[PDB]
Swiss-Prot record, chains A, B, C:
<keyword id="KW-0426">Late protein</keyword>
<keyword id="KW-1161">Viral attachment to host cell</keyword>
<dbReference type="GO" id="GO:0007155">
    <property type="term" value="P:cell adhesion"/>
</dbReference>
<comment type="subunit">
    <text>Homotrimer. Interacts with host receptor CD46. Interacts (via N-terminal tail region) with pentons.</text>
</comment>
<comment type="similarity">
    <text>Belongs to the adenoviridae fiber family.</text>
</comment>
<dbReference type="GO" id="GO:0019028">
    <property type="term" value="C:viral capsid"/>
</dbReference>
<keyword id="KW-0946">Virion</keyword>
<protein>
    <recommendedName>
        <fullName>Fiber protein</fullName>
    </recommendedName>
</protein>
<keyword id="KW-1160">Virus entry into host cell</keyword>
Curated annotation (Swiss-Prot), chains D, E, F:
<comment type="subunit">
    <text>Interacts with C3b. Interacts with C4b. Interacts with moesin/MSN.</text>
</comment>
<feature type="glycosylation site" description="N-linked (GlcNAc...) asparagine">
    <location>
        <position position="80"/>
    </location>
</feature>
<comment type="function">
    <text>Acts as a cofactor for complement factor I, a serine protease which protects autologous cells against complement-mediated injury by cleaving C3b and C4b deposited on host tissue. May be involved in the fusion of the spermatozoa with the oocyte during fertilization. Also acts as a costimulatory factor for T-cells which induces the differentiation of CD4+ into T-regulatory 1 cells. T-regulatory 1 cells suppress immune responses by secreting interleukin-10, and therefore are thought to prevent autoimmunity.</text>
</comment>
<feature type="disulfide bond">
    <location>
        <begin position="65"/>
        <end position="107"/>
    </location>
</feature>
<feature type="glycosylation site" description="N-linked (GlcNAc...) asparagine">
    <location>
        <position position="49"/>
    </location>
</feature>
<comment type="subunit">
    <text>(Microbial infection) Interacts (via N-terminus) with measles virus H protein; this interaction allows attachment and viral entry of vaccine and laboratory-adapted strains.</text>
</comment>
<comment type="function">
    <text>(Microbial infection) A number of viral and bacterial pathogens seem to bind MCP in order to exploit its immune regulation property and directly induce an immunosuppressive phenotype in T-cells.</text>
</comment>
<feature type="domain" description="Sushi 1">
    <location>
        <begin position="1"/>
        <end position="62"/>
    </location>
</feature>
<feature type="disulfide bond">
    <location>
        <begin position="93"/>
        <end position="123"/>
    </location>
</feature>
Amino acid sequence: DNINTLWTGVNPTEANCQIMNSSESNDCKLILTLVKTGALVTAFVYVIGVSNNFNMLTTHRNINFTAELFFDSTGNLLTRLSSLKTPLNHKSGQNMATGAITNAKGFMPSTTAYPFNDNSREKENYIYGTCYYTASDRTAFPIDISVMLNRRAINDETSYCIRITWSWNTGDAPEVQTSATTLVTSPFTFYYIREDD
Amino acid sequence: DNINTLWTGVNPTEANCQIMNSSESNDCKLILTLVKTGALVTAFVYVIGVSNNFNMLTTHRNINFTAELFFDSTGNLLTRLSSLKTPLNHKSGQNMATGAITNAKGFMPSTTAYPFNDNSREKENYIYGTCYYTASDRTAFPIDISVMLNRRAINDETSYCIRITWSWNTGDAPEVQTSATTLVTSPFTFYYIREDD
Amino acid sequence: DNINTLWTGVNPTEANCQIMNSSESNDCKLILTLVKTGALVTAFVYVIGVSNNFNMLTTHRNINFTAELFFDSTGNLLTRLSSLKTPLNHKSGQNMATGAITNAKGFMPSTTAYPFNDNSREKENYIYGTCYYTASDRTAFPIDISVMLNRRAINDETSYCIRITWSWNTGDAPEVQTSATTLVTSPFTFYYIREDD
Amino acid sequence: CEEPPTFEAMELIGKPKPYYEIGERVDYKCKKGYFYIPPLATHTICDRNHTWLPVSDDACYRETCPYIRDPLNGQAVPANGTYEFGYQMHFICNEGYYLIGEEILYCELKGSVAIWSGKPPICEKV
Amino acid sequence: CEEPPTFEAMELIGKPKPYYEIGERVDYKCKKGYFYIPPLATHTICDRNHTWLPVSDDACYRETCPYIRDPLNGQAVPANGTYEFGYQMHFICNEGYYLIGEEILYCELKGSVAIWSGKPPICEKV
Amino acid sequence: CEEPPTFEAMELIGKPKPYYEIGERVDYKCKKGYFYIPPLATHTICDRNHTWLPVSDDACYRETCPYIRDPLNGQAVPANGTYEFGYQMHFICNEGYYLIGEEILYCELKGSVAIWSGKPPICEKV
Ligand SMILES: *[C@@H]1O[C@H](CO)[C@@H](O[C@@H]2O[C@H](CO)[C@@H](O[C@@H]3O[C@H](CO)[C@@H](O)[C@H](O)[C@@H]3O)[C@H](O)[C@H]2NC(C)=O)[C@H](O)[C@H]1NC(C)=O
Ligand SMILES: *[C@@H]1O[C@H](CO)[C@@H](O[C@@H]2O[C@H](CO)[C@@H](O[C@@H]3O[C@H](CO)[C@@H](O)[C@H](O)[C@@H]3O)[C@H](O)[C@H]2NC(C)=O)[C@H](O)[C@H]1NC(C)=O
Ligand SMILES: *[C@@H]1O[C@H](CO)[C@@H](O[C@@H]2O[C@H](CO)[C@@H](O[C@@H]3O[C@H](CO)[C@@H](O)[C@H](O)[C@@H]3O)[C@H](O)[C@H]2NC(C)=O)[C@H](O)[C@H]1NC(C)=O
Ligand SMILES: [Ca+2]
Ligand SMILES: [Ca+2]
Ligand SMILES: [Ca+2]
């Protein structure tokens, strides 16, 4: 009975997300876990860089990338429109199950709480917080996170939307040529009212 | 089986909370969701300003308002004493159910973990964090949140207490006459040990 | 059916943790609650100082202490190796139950998501955030929290590890001789992918 | 019964009324700056003969300022034998020492909280 | 049908192709800076005779700059009767007052968002 | 068996004792600065004849300093062929360039972690 999790599965073999547009082929490995907890959904997310280009952003003083996630009328990932290029599914050990998703809608960000095109309630479509990139010298580099819950639809298919966006802009880059390695964010957990099944 | 949520329901038609004392009639719309998750309760809360006065605070350099919530010996909102002027209930789609609340006590902040009048454990009655008002120019304005779990009772009826208080005091107000609109906070999720049923 | 919580129980009679090495006998009372929520575990933790020495750290300008928690191949606290000197158990009112723990493994930080000795994934073993010590004059003193999920094992018994570490280093200590009392942190809630049962 | 009684540490919940019928209840709540301590009541019912039952505001105690131990080599003394607001804390340093940061603090009410009018003093070598 | 039509406020999802068979569908998505509003379609199928069905990009409206009320004792007017990007906001202060922070703002597109080229002006006593 | 053996990278869990009975077990734990790597044991039992079974501290490796790639147009070389603490990293810039931020870093132990005694140098044009 793992139908309360709709997640990417733990650390995937190959990259599953293509976050950089200056890119093609899946530059990173996006881990996402939505768990049904009461009238809310617990969103757990972070990213594991895989391609050399993405990994090298840590050497930059001012960055920001976005992971756009669109779902259709049933709660299914729109893969061609989204950054996550491979569907989510229920828990099956540390991996994605392989079958029909039970009540996907239930995991979507409620349109009642987070609407589309309502400028009078726009402010209500945002979630913010902080995650940390843990640098070479072991210091904690804070990264800003903005989250927009389905405010603007992308076409006649996108029934729900979740757009996470990481960013940072300081005096110095969180890394340097000789120390850089992988770009990894710490788990960022946020909450939102869920659509009804 | 939505008896694990005791919430205000999603975005209510009319304002349900009266946060400003300089006020009368319900100045805002307080959204609150308590979900039973293990020996803890997940509290999800934020506010949607409705009255022009409350909405205009964003034009002020130093503000702070409190939402006082008192419950009786059974876990029922004391409406006359609280800011939330209308009872909470279980989940029923995006709305409050309409019937007997099953195990309200279970949602209350444990008196064992957060006591009354124990000055030696006072420090243990507080929860802090940050939410964000998303301003006109789209910048994220941080708002400070302090939470006091039933430390001081208000009379012989208040068996439990939850007092949330938002505040900010910077060099400039998060808004200006021509840009102001609605005062909205982002969901602030906190945790606390729950009383036993 | 409280087998979804594996916790220290609410506010224990005697101190249960020995955080200070410059110490012996259990200097504080560590409260810890792990709740199974989906493919994740909700960790809720903070500390209640008990011994005079520990309580007096608040008079220091730069501090930091760690609470090391090791578990064996089955999910059981290694008491002699850990700071928490007394086992965890399921919920039973506000106290620890007294019997066989059902599926402890299930509460452990997944080795798949947080591995051992993998320097290429090291960054993925960290969790950060903030808790607050609420000082005498009622101001909120922020304390930094770093969390390392089982990266380095301590011997052939430690199958999982959870190391929380609080710290602060400012211009002034959060207290002064005449005002000091108890050292208490506010609940710090974090998340992590759980091992499979 | 006529308009319920009024108190100094406890006020009436809701707007008062000129007349009240038998069996009616009226509730109070500790004022701003006070708090409740069991088991005394904070409500009263209008009995058979139109005079409210006995009722007090003794269940409502004043908020207190945080504790203050003696400043090393000196002494802090609750001038009025209480930490409650509306009172004061005094500081006398010991013989061989002299007091610096002046030596009276007033536990005052500020909003819904009792707080010291300042900071404790200290004693130095002389 | 040959390569699907192209639009100004809506672009093709995926790489186009020279030839297309009957019953095939092609989907578009509002471009960067635009958004969808029901119920018009953003896709089309290649029918029996190899010419796509009718299709528009009218379901995709431009992102708009935030609202701007009249600066006290002055007036803010949407020069082009719209808040949409690619347009401008003008400010005239009232008779007895004079304008300071100059008095044209351009609602421009920046990335995936429409934003004012600056800040509203204000009117002072004269 | 008498007091268990002692090791350099592994220490005894709990206070030692003068005498030990057969079948008793004693456990060690990698010291501060070291870590465990399967599958070697870190414990031992006092057998029939009062001499502990064979036991080593080879399952405990030293903490290592983070990796350091060659400074553009220069070379970083692990002087002692290891990143482990108690050793050093050396930097020689290439022919046409000169080294600035001096050119030895010492991977040292600080608390429970191995860290470089500083920062890598860089090479400039000459
Ligand atoms: C709290 O305790 C203090 C200390 O006993 C009380 O304050 C002090 O009260 C006395 C008399 O009530 C004041 O004395 C007056 O002094 C002037 C000249 O100094 C003298 O001419 C008058 O005849 C009178 O004796 C004294 O000024 C005052 N101290 C301070 C700090 O101002 C106070 O009354 C106690 N509070 C309560 C509510 O009882
Ligand atoms: C948005 O509304 C504004 C206001 O009507 C339009 O901008 C203004 O457009 C006019 C004519 O299109 C420009 O006038 C030109 O002025 C020069 C000298 O000032 C004159 O020699 C030319 O013959 C011509 O009349 C005017 O410069 C311009 N105002 C600004 C601020 O530059 C604009 O066209 C509207 N936008 C759209 C897309 O319709
Ligand atoms: C880590 O590798 C370095 C490099 O090989 C070793 O440090 C160097 O060790 C040598 C000999 O052990 C030291 O040489 C001495 O130099 C003085 C004058 O410079 C000379 O008179 C002596 O006869 C001797 O040759 C050298 O000073 C030292 N380098 C530094 C940076 O001080 C080191 O031994 C290796 N570490 C380990 C644990 O093996
Ligand atoms: Ca009284
Ligand atoms: Ca068009
Ligand atoms: Ca060895």
